[PDB]
């Protein structure tokens, strides 16, 4: 079989993320979404919420699973018995950094990284920006999954 | 009438900023410079000084006013009864980030953002770099307005 | 009054173009779309068709007019009694070239150029690509105005 | 099964190309290299030579086949019963153009495009540059497959 | 001694070029400006004029000489008994292409390429753009050396 | 004589750094590596270790010396009686920032900055990434000098 890992901190998962999950799932036999715990105490949602939110946003993709990532992405990829990372590109991606890590990741573990541009309508949303805009009262509900909108409403109220 | 907002933290306003103010004022009936209070306690000049400095540097532009910005830029723009942001581009601008925010700002409030490249002679000055260079004794007086040079001299001595 | 020129060869005008026309018209008192005749004998549509197509695609914008451009863009801008160019940015824009021409245009004639990112859904269409995709049988009708789709159908059949 | 198409004009196939073929073949059940005939009469090697050269350079990859591409890449991809393009990124790739075509290709046919950075040691070779450097007597043999070096020697002598 | 080559087609040499020549001459014992004959019959000035123009624009730099380049830049560099190329960066430079050629040039001949940003006031001039703007009547005399302005006047009249 | 300064925090010096040192030393009479103490208490290796590591990694370059930098880079350059900075470019370099500082540095002190792309095989290593990858158990020993690998082993154990 063929497999890819979609790594990230998904705090929260946006519809740009989901778009990329959907494309990974159509093109690989299995997809694993690896949720990577923020280095220090820094999140808006705790791990369980992030997992639930990804899970709840991906029920339509039966070949995808959600797991917490630990250590080097490449080590996790290898443990999933895979050799591919799939990363989404959006407006504001630091692509040069992504490239530097792609080359490093290939160097140290032979893992390939495939990049895919997210749909234009979801290309300007990031977890960071969605949070900052929502905290100051802006409406980003069209760019997040409903499971995320539900949890974002509660935590704001 | 037609109107644009030039948002920023102007800590301090440079002559790159002024160049952009000047171009906004020539092309729109009214210009509002929105000074956006640094999120946490982080400035070099307090709000009043920043306002004074912008005011003192823009006496030649009668169709421009200076106001403190609050909340989402787009909310402020709408409150000024305008629908346009004018942002300057210089060497070192994170243009991809600017673009991501431009698309988000259009999405949530229908506000357009116009980008204009600052004059080559003012294209390498930023508030950040002007401060760091001046603190370590370098001469950046040719890239800042005289009202700013006056206040930068005092605070360094 | 305030005014901007939207220059280009509009062979054919796409909905990315129109998006930009719409934004120019909302923010300036008058907009002039300047159709710039291809240097040598190189178009798909002749000048009259290009004019008709822009005209037919902009009936909802009463403050915009369509004129054939001649010579230096800046000379045309000045002749329209304006001092601003408005250019759209899309995926694939040579922005560095646009910037070089913006600085040159300011140098030689004091004309400012404002850049505005086109809507994400129209950000991957260009006249060039729309033509190449349509010639080889692909459907680009969602990214062109109906006046353009009508004329593109006929010329393909 | 899962499948990807690696499109291009491979005139000639370089070791940057092969690097990408190798990565596609490891991650997808079948890979098809689509050789796309230059629009007008413009090649250095004719189609048969290009096919032979790709074939001869990919004998170690049993899950890959070489076919001549016709029309829209996306139409060929669909005909191969696949929905993925795999493209290599190297120094000098026009990535903005690649992105514009990726979004267009997704729009018109639902085909995803995955981008993968070629190995650093093969990242500065292109068919174009390899030809220009070799014609003027430079040694690019370390950056081309041996089947290509053999045919490039003969045609130069 | 230390040495660098400044390669190009200098049709015509601009003041951006001269700025770079000046910086090369201050930092290396000898500088050679290599004028590289356009591949086909394509120039505005013939070789002799280009040489004269560079010569006449560099009389203040006694450690610089002007020579016609032939073949691979790296072959010329080696023949000058040097191992360094100095290239200017301006607005509109295709830097990715410059980088690809820098890596190729190092690969095939061990020649290093140093890049230096041209002065902001000369950063938007190119030979190409200066010619196109001047042909259509624009004034680019502030961005070209006087020897070039003299010859550009005559050829336009 | 001719001279260049290679500034940085070299925490630790990588083989990308050394590649650049080597190229500077071949092209300039003297090279000074300026180690610039991290602003606050933030390093992995203290100054003495950084100096030792650079020293131990550059014994093959007799025309290079290592010194601790203080204040503005340009002030240090001037004190070394030089007027040139040599900076390496790798994947992930913030080149726009480098350019902004190059223009500022030229403005305030007349110091030129030359940029040189590091060898492809060392183009994805940075001090930052090498540390993060090594802390989480990855093998980056092929991208660091042996003096650095020795000290990185000890500090990890
Ligand atoms: C690969 C990696 C870049 C992806 O994880 P990510 O946290 O989702 O980050 P992304 O690149 O996807 O996008 C933005 C990211 O900036 C991250 N970020 C965290 N703190 C940030 C800071 N103070 N400022 C800027 N960005 C920050 C965001 O977390 C992260 O997403 P978000 O900010 O939108 O919430 C991250 O570096 C990582 O992988 N950690 C596991 C590390 C690993 O394997 N390292 C070896 C490196 S080759
Ligand atoms: C739009 C915005 C980017 C412009 O404000 P700005 O503070 O002047 O910042 P700029 O983009 O113009 O230029 C550099 C900026 O980096 C800002 N900055 C502040 N802290 C910084 C950090 N720790 N590191 C990097 N940059 C930082 C600078 O403040 C700011 O200017 P300066 O650093 O030269 O003093 C800023 O994000 C903002 O708008 N705040 C109001 C927010 C809003 O509407 N958000 C919804 C987002 S779509
Ligand atoms: C400003 C200018 C760049 C805009 O006109 P434009 O033709 O619409 O071109 P754009 O930059 O908008 O976008 C793509 C352009 O590439 C143009 N183009 C024409 N021939 C091309 C070639 N052989 N290859 C690449 N692009 C080409 C396209 O015409 C043009 O649009 P299109 O290709 O999608 O049909 C054009 O250079 C111009 O302005 N001519 C008037 C010139 C002037 O004032 N020059 C002084 C220069 S500062
Ligand atoms: C997708 C496509 C960009 C890839 O094919 P490619 O010819 O290998 O080109 P690449 O992007 O891979 O890399 C460089 C390319 O520039 C191409 N090129 C051809 N003529 C060129 C010109 N006069 N100048 C610049 N580049 C040229 C090169 O052929 C090609 O490779 P090469 O130059 O190194 O020999 C090409 O556009 C294509 O796909 N043709 C089939 C088209 C299709 O489906 N079009 C719908 C568009 S969304
Ligand atoms: C290195 C090289 C890029 C520099 O020469 P240059 O002609 O001055 O070109 P530059 O990169 O400096 O800047 C713009 C260039 O585009 C060149 N150019 C020529 N025809 C062009 C075309 N049809 N369209 C786009 N640009 C063109 C310009 O000549 C040239 O300067 P100009 O256009 O402003 O008159 C050129 O490729 C060369 O070096 N020829 C000698 C080649 C060599 O050694 N090749 C081995 C390659 S690694
Ligand atoms: C010129 C300068 C950019 C080079 O020093 P450098 O520390 O080696 O940094 P580099 O640009 O080379 O590369 C990455 C750098 O990010 C630096 N960095 C330090 N803290 C960082 C932060 N919190 N986040 C992002 N990067 C950081 C790194 O130190 C530094 O190298 P490293 O991160 O790989 O350990 C640095 O700004 C400097 O020069 N200090 C002396 C300053 C001076 O003259 N200033 C006047 C400015 S024109």
């Amino acid at each position: 079989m063929t497999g890819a890992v979609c790594p990230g901190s998904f705090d929260p998962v946006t519809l740009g993320h989901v778009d990329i999950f959907e494309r990974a799932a159509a093109q690989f036999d299995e997809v694993v979404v690896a949720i990577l715990v923020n280095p220090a105490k820094t999140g808006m949602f705790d791990l369980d919420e992030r997992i639930a939110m990804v899970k709840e946003s991906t029920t339509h993709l039966p070949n995808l699973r959600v797991q917490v990532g630990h250590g080097l992405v490449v080590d996790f990829v290898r443990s999933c018995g895979m050799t591919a990372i799939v990363k989404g590109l959006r407006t504001g991606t630091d692509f040069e950094y992504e490239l530097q890590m792609a080359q490093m990741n290939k160097h140290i573990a032979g893992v390939d990284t495939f990049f895919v541009a997210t749909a234009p309508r979801y290309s300007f949303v990031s977890s960071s920006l969605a949070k900052e805009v929502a905290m100051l009262g802006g409406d980003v509900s069209e760019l997040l999954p409903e499971p995320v909108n539900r949890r974002l409403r509660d935590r704001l109220n």
Side-chain angles (χ1 to χ4, degrees), chain A:
Chain A
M1 78 226 67
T2 60
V5 181
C6 301
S9 56
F10 317 99
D11 179 44
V13 60
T14 79
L15 285 167
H17 294 132
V18 169
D19 177 44
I20 297 310
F21 297 161
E22 290 182 347
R23 291 148 102 139
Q27 307 292 349
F28 293 87
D29 292 312
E30 190 196 338
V31 172
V32 177
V33 181
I35 307 182
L36 292 146
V37 48
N38 293 7
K41 185 308 144 206
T42 30
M44 169 181 291
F45 302 91
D46 60 35
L47 204 45
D48 292 27
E49 285 171 301
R50 302 188 205 194
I51 300 155
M53 278 183 298
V54 176
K55 280 216 216 303
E56 282 171 34
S57 310
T58 46
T59 62
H60 62 301
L61 304 176
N63 65 152
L64 175 157
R65 39 171 282 246
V66 184
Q67 224 232 97
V68 184
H70 301 275
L72 288 177
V73 176
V74 289
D75 278 339
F76 187 82
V77 177
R78 283 322 203 120
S79 289
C80 293
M82 298 174 169
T83 58
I85 293 152
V86 168
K87 292 198 102 151
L89 304 164
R90 101 271 157 167
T91 309
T93 299
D94 184 354
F95 188 48
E96 295 63 42
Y97 191 40
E98 286 305 321
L99 283 168
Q100 189 202 180
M101 291 198 281
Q103 302 293 41
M104 184 60 90
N105 285 349
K106 184 70 185 188
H107 169 76
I108 66 161
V111 171
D112 301 313
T113 306
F114 294 84
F115 295 102
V116 52
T118 85
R121 73 185 196 261
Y122 301 120
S123 64
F124 55 84
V125 62
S126 58
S127 296
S128 200
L129 191 57
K131 286 188 300 207
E132 293 161 345
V133 170
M135 289 183 297
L136 316 186
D139 179 30
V140 288
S141 71
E142 283 178 78
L143 316 162
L144 299 180
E146 200 45 35
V148 173
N149 291 329
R150 184 228 309 160
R151 278 187 192 73
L152 204 57
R153 259 153 225 156
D154 299 346
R155 211 173 142 94
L156 270 35
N157 306 9

